[model samples]
Target: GSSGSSGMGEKTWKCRECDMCFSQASSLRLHQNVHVGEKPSGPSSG
Candidate 1:
């Protein structure tokens, strides 16, 4: 739902790779598996 989390400790960071945002309790979902490395060749996701 792209709805976003509360600031219970959330922080945003951008990975140099995916140009996507990081979501975390300052580090939770933040770049862990969302988009921490190489995005692929498909114009669509796998």
Candidate 2:
């Protein structure tokens, strides 16, 4: 369940502010973009 403290699970990691969980630390940062910002998809977008 995605409704517990950071130490609730060994596989899940949580953000300091939001309780978003990810199996891997890298996924947390990548998923953060969805919350912070997600630009329109297109060539040269990056």
Candidate 3:
């Protein structure tokens, strides 16, 4: 969690499942959101 505004463009840990971004680095383990295993046709955009 951050203190103020979003720091997206300033080196943030991003989640490919959606558009969720984290301010901490190497936090890829926290990508345990819904549809984690169903990687067929998720939020994937074509």
Number of the predicted model whose TM-score against the real structure is largest: 2
lDDT of each: 0.52, 0.63, 0.60
Better of 2 and 3 by TM-score: 2
The parts of candidate 1 lying over 4 Å away from their true place are: 1-10, 25-46
Candidate 2 residue-wise lDDT at 5:
66
TM-scores, each model vs. reference: 0.26, 0.40, 0.36
Candidate 2 least-lDDT 10 residues: 37-46
lDDT of the structure predicted as candidate 1: 0.52
Candidate 1 per-residue C-alpha lDDT over 1-46 given as tens digits, one digit per residue, 9 for 90 to 100 = 5766555754567555455665633554454455434664325657
Ranking by TM-score: 2, 3, 1
For model 2, what is the alpha-carbon lDDT of residue 15? Answer: 59
User: What shift in Å separates residue 29 of candidate 2 from its native position after superposition?
Assistant: 0.8
**Which scores better on lDDT, 1 or 2?**
2
Best candidate, lDDT:
2
State the TM-score for model 2: 0.40
* Residue pairs with backbone overlap in model 1: none
Q: What RMSD does model 1 have? A: 8.5
Q: What clash count does candidate 3 reach?
A: 0
Name every residue pair that clashes in candidate 3: none
lDDT of 3 by residue, 1-46 (tens): 5576565556777766565677775565465454466663466477
